[PDB]
Amino acid sequence: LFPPQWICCDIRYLDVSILGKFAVVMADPPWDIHMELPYGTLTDDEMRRLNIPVLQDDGFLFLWVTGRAMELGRECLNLWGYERVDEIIWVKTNQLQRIIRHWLNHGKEHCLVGVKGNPQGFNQGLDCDVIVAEVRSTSHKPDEIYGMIERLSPGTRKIELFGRPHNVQPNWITLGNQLDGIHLLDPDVVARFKQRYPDG
Amino acid sequence: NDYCQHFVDTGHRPQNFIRDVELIRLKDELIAKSNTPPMYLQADIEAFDIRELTPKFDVILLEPPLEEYYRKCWTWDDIMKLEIDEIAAPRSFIFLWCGSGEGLDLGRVCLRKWGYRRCEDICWIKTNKNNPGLDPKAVFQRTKEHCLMGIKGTDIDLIITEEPEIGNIEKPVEIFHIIEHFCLGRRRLHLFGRDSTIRPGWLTVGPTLTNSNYNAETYASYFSAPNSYLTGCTEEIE
Numbered sequence A: 001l002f003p004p005q006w007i008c009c010d011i012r013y014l015d016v017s018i019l020g021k022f023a024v025v026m027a028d029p030p031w032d033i034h035m036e037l038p039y040g041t042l043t044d045d046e047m048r049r050l051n052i053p054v055l056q057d058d059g060f061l062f063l064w065v066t067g068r069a070m071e072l073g074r075e076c077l078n079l080w081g082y083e084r085v086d087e088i089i090w091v092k093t094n095q096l097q098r099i100i101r102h103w104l105n106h107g108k109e110h111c112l113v114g115v116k117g118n119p120q121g122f123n124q125g126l127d128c129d130v131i132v133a134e135v136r137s138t139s140h141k142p143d144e145i146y147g148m149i150e151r152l153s154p155g156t157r158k159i160e161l162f163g164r165p166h167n168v169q170p171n172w173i174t175l176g177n178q179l180d181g182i183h184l185l186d187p188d189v190v191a192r193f194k195q196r197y198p199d200g
Numbered sequence B: 001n002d003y004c005q006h007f008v009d010t011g012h013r014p015q016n017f018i019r020d021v022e023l024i025r026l027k028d029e030l031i032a033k034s035n036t037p038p039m040y041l042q043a044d045i046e047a048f049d050i051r052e053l054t055p056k057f058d059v060i061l062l063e064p065p066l067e068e069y070y071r072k073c074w075t076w077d078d079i080m081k082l083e084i085d086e087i088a089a090p091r092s093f094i095f096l097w098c099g100s101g102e103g104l105d106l107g108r109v110c111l112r113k114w115g116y117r118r119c120e121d122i123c124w125i126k127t128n129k130n131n132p133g134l135d136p137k138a139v140f141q142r143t144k145e146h147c148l149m150g151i152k153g154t155d156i157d158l159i160i161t162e163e164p165e166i167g168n169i170e171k172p173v174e175i176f177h178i179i180e181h182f183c184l185g186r187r188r189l190h191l192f193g194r195d196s197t198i199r200p201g202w203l204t205v206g207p208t209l210t211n212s213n214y215n216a217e218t219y220a221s222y223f224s225a226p227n228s229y230l231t232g233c234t235e236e237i238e
Ligand SMILES: O=C([N][C]C1=[C]N2[C]=C([C][N][C][C]3[C][C][C][C][C]3)[C]=[C]C2=N1)C1=[C]C(=O)N2=[C][C]=[C][C]=C2[N]1
Pocket: A009, A010, A011, A012, A028, A029, A030, A031, A039, A040, A041, A042, A064, A065, A066, A109, A110, A139, A140, A141, A162, A163, A164, A175, A176, A177, A178
């Protein structure tokens, strides 16, 4: 196990190649659901043009979706050269395990699961595709997904895009523009960073 | 509590543990007052000029028998060839049962094809309380089915029941409750319905139906001014 690493940055301008390859990529991106939202978004093009394909030779993508981002994420996920093999739903329960509140109340959140290439070693079929968990936070996923994924690919390198500070977990490099600076430890990335960003 | 971490220990799906699974009673009774007689037509849909159904439909429930449902079938290939656009009304809805495999994708392709945009994704979440305990492509044990809701022209999104006895192909009735509570129109069609699903306010059409009562002129007669427009939730008009 490897302590949390992270890099505050615009995930539009960064040279993700320096970081190499991960068995698992996850993103909870700030989609341009045109609500005039209370945080910064990416346009569709920005998302399409995201430099995902560089991060994995083989392995899995965990992409969170919502509203129209259910259609666009599929697009993004195909354009990035993944096939979707699973769609995890999160069921939001209160502290008493009752469900919580577009023609219907949304009681669930969706996380598409993409595969790329021929991945091996994975304990496929260990978890099931429903997560039942309290809405402890505001706009965040549940800790349960880091559980499910480590059980899936134990001990491998994993990266997270648009991860905010509390999403930082062992084995996970977290990229995002709301992280407290840079914290890196894998010397082979330290090496590759310094020379690519000679003064950050 | 990690109910995924638990399921792994035992085989009790996280959904096993969801406790509670000003009444809407008038709405039910107004649905009931408005409801047409049930109708049904035994028909080989593949072998069946689809345009032989009228008037156009305010709502459509597509429950086609997937290869996967079993561990004559329809492939997404076959389903996608249907000409649903041609019997949907200008302002029309559709509820398409998609399974949990390719259907979550190919059904969206279907919706766009027939001129729908998906505004809701409804999940049937199955429990294994009576049975604590996959296709090769899959990564996780699959424990839900999806119904996609589509709109053409300008209650929660979950259903919790026990996993049916395997090979029993039926979908929770709750679906009808959700449709009927939207008050979308009285012109309602169930494709690939069975004898078992026949229901007042619905035209069931499918190959396995053992009897037919359907007649276009007669059916049409049920929506002749002043009944054409009604919600299904309104009163009738003397
Ligand atoms: O770090 C960045 N974004 C952080 C981040 C991630 N998200 C995710 C959500 C959506 N939550 C989804 C919920 C529903 C589904 C289940 C899980 C929870 C909401 C807000 C949010 N802010 C960031 C990096 C960057 O380069 N950049 C560039 C340009 C503009 C913005 C921008 N932003």
